[PDB]
A paper describes a structure:
NAMPT functions as a homo-dimeric enzyme that catalyzes the rate limiting step in the primary salvage pathway for NAD synthesis, the transfer of a phosphoribosyl residue from 5-phosphoribosyl-1-pyrophosphate (PRPP) to nicotinamide (NAM) to produce nicotinamide mononucleotide (NMN). Crystal structures of NAMPT in numerous ligand-bound forms have been reported. These structures consistently display a NAMPT homo-dimer with two essentially identical active sites at the dimer interface. Typical NAMPT inhibitors were found to occupy the portion of active site responsible for NAM binding and a tunnel-shaped cavity extending from the NAM binding site. Furthermore, we determine the crystal structures of six NAMPT mutants in the apo form and in complex with various inhibitors and present a definitive model to explain the differential effects of the mutations on various structural classes of NAMPT inhibitors.
The crystal structures of G217 mutants revealed that they also perturbed inhibitor binding through a His191-mediated mechanism. Glycine is required for this position to allow a water molecule to bind and participate in the D219-H191-WAT-Y188 network. The addition of a Cβ atom in G217A occludes the water molecule and disrupts the hydrogen bond network. In addition, A217 pushes the H191 imidazole ring away from its normal orientation by 30°, rendering this part of the tunnel less compatible with GNE-618 binding. Similar to H191R, inhibitors with narrow and flexible linkers, including APO866, are less sensitive to the relatively subtle changes induced by the G217A and G217V mutations, which is also consistent with the modest drop in the biochemical potency of compounds 9-11. Compounds with a bulky phenyl group in the core (series A and compound 12) were less active on all G217 mutants, while compounds with a narrow more flexible linker (series B and compound 11) maintain much of their potency on the more conservative changes of G217A and G217V.
Numbering used by the authors:
A (entry chain A): 8 to 43, 53 to 487
B (entry chain B): 8 to 42, 52 to 486
The structure:
């Protein structure tokens, strides 16, 4: 079972001995620090952490003794704050005397703004605020995935609109294939849920269970998939029977959309000769609601996409849409699910536009690129102490390393506000109290062991909408 | 609760309908596919996956109905194989009819070799082999962490040996600070455990519990830490009181080693004036077993390390060791815990060598670089089908994409062997049965819901040692 006393960085165990004596309050904040592009971030994921790990009775006699035993060996010394944890157990029935205030989930906030703050609600628990830094800071991951997914949605929307005149199907143009490429089952659920903030296309099922348990949607599920082959379901038929495999699978799934990986031996032969001649009759008869979706999976992603399109365009009846771009017949589409990250996504749609192919023809699958190839320094997600009270006097505190101005942290009590032009500003030094900038956008979401405000996944999606979607 | 019927890629739900009719066997393997870096990998972490997710009764009526209801909405259609999963429930009491063979954990094997194989033990369950690809393939992460961690140990060993004449303290020279920088609690435990295959220094507490539960050590714990400050324990004292913070912390931890972050405002001032002058008397009185470990945390990592060392070497009594390199007194050390990954680690130690500083002086902390900035394509970890039986006839199967030879997979029944020169070779096409290469080095580790062979964390560590350690 999860033990909050064993869910921190080891050195934090020793910090209760290092703060200034007579310190009654430690107040800390999280930002995605600005760096001298990712100019705005989606706040998403805190609610999951609050519910799974921080709420309710998280301290027990047994958990205290377990931690004491572990730390005695780990440190080869007794340095553990057994008294402090006992106090929380006795006074608060093991609920954390902590208050967390946060921007609403799904909100899209420029870099360098406070997104949440943390403080102890009992003077004895000054040490507790930063104890939970480690667990709260992991919110960087759903924030970063949601943000990066949204940034790719902006690219897709831009090119789709330019090449087609609309945004139909935008929410299915980036399909999560990342389940096998992430570091764990838990990460898979979290990351998949973050992508779903922006899109509805996914193969990472763990996402759906997380959303149902922690957020909830009006619809039965937040995300969807369609039948698709993998290489094993093609190669199992034998090298000489790729066509038999193709035929069997599109016939099995004749009335729904079906993706068929086509590069097992020779992607270009498969498109030109197998799909384009041998089995053409099984493709052109298909419904508009059930296209064949041809899937290349190797080679340079842009070059292979263009070559596949060029091949298919000469074997199938292509039209020119009202924008002047080429469109495959409705029963035939393509998905590129290899080598896709935000960078190659951009290169591919731009290459397509250059060769006069509509973005309507294509969708993208991304796995590692989407859910794994991201770190905490992408958005400089960071948690810092900005305010303490020592001997009954509050002091504004911060770091400001001489060699790196980018690492300077904010000072004092913080609040988030709308600017007169409708943007965001973070007020420092408790200046929000002057009430010159309207209401604080942070809300209490956790206080003394209870989750005090929650958002549905539907609200989060609404908050995270693109401007182009609003317009 | 965890539901293995909901722990696969969506499309695999539809694959039982896509295999050739009358397929009775699907056999698949995992390798770190070959492409000058990462020529060999540490096999680690499958044991965790077998135990936490695959073993025992993993199928119930409840789980089957839950999967049915989710998939009906997820596909907007009924395509889920209720019957196949019920068959497993009713025939095998929900235990998976699967056999898995694997190289021993901790083993170091060149790229391009079979590391584990998977096959169904019941003909009705031909579809099960690749259903669990997704979960098994996540072994890439502990493999990749362990491997990249060990490569860093190699660098440290080489430089420590050259600048000091020995390897004392090697296993404490790379310290896991990645708890906050990974994507989840589960990842934290897995990744930290993997680092611990090579080192004993960690702040990622989650790793200890995983190791204790799934592997085991003779010693009470696999990894250790020491007291250390963070910016909040310095800055809370106020900008004008950095000295008071330093003095309090080192006095509180006077007889154990203590790391103190010294760059909150001005690292060079803190080293030269606060540590080097105002508080010097509190440092030079410390035990060899309880050094002050000064921690810079910003600026160019190499440049800052060198300047910190130059500063300290002028304020403190420096010796020259037997190899001719400079050594801080034993009560004073440095840890660089910012911007450290395998590339910058190499750059720092090489730069220290050029300025004649022993690697004895320093340790490194790595977080994101150690546990998060890694992907499945670093070692090309990959799971593929190589052998099927259909209509009673065994077929050797494979992919071979025209535009990418590096993605070609292996054919047929596989086995792993020692060569006459004592290296590893993977035999394809069932050629291991010809018995020209001696015994298959893979062992059966899972069969029909039971874990059938396992390794302690002490043995895994022994298997993973460096040559120079041997």
């Amino acid at each position: 079972e999860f033990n909050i006393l064993l869910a921190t960085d080891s050195y934090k165990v020793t910090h209760y001995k290092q703060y200034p004596p007579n310190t009654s309050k430690v107040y800390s904040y999280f930002e995605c620090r600005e760096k001298k592009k990712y100019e705005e971030t989606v706040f998403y994921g805190l609610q999951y952490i609050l519910n799974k790990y921080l709420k309710g009775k998280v301290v027990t006699k047994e958990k205290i003794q377990e931690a004491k035993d572990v730390y005695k060996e780990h440190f080869q010394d007794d340095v553990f704050n057994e008294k402090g944890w006992n106090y929380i157990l006795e006074k608060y029935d093991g609920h954390l005397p902590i208050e967390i205030k946060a921007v609403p989930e799904g909100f899209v906030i420029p870099r360098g703004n406070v997104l949440f703050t943390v403080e102890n609600t009992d003077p004895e628990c000054y040490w507790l605020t930063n104890w939970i830094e480690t667990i709260l800071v992991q919110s960087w991951y759903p924030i970063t995935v949601a943000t990066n997914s949204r940034e790719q949605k902006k690219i897709l929307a831009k090119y789709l609109l330019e090449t087609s005149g609309n945004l139909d199907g935008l929410e299915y143009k980036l399909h999560d294939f990342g389940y096998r490429g992430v570091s764990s089952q838990e990460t898979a659920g979290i990351g998949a849920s973050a992508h779903l903030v922006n899109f509805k296309a996914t193969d990472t099922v763990a996402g759906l269970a997380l959303i149902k348990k922690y957020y909830g949607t009006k619809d039965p599920v937040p995300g969807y998939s369609v039948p698709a082959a993998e290489h094993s379901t093609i190669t199992a038929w034998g090298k000489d029977h790729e066509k038999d495999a193709f035929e069997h699978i599109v016939t099995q799934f004749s009335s729904v959309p079906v993706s068929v990986v086509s590069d097992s031996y020779d992607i270009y032969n498969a498109c030109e000769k197998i799909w384009g001649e041998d089995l053409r009759h099984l493709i052109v008869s298909r419904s508009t609601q059930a296209p064949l979706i041809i899937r290349p999976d190797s080679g340079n992603p842009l070059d292979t996409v263009l070559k596949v399109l060029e091949i298919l365009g000469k074997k199938f009846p292509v039209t020119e849409n009202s924008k002047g771009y080429k469109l495959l017949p409705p029963y035939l589409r393509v998905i590129q699910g290899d080598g896709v990250d935000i960078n190659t996504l951009q290169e591919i749609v731009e290459g397509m536009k250059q060769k006069m192919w509509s973005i309507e023809n294509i969708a993208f699958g991304s796995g590692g690129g989407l859910l794994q190839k991201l770190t905490r320094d992408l958005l400089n997600c960071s948690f810092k102490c900005s305010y303490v009270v020592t001997n009954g006097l509050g002091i504004n505190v911060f770091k400001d390393p001489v060699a790196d101005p980018n690492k300077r942290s904010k000072k004092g009590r913080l609040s988030l506000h709308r600017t007169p032009a409708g943007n965001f500003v973070t007020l420092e030094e408790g200046k929000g109290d002057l009430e010159e900038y309207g209401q604080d956008l942070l809300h209490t979401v956790f206080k003394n062991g209870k989750v005090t405000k929650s958002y549905s996944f539907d609200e989060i999606r609404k908050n995270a909408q693109l401007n182009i979607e609003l317009e």
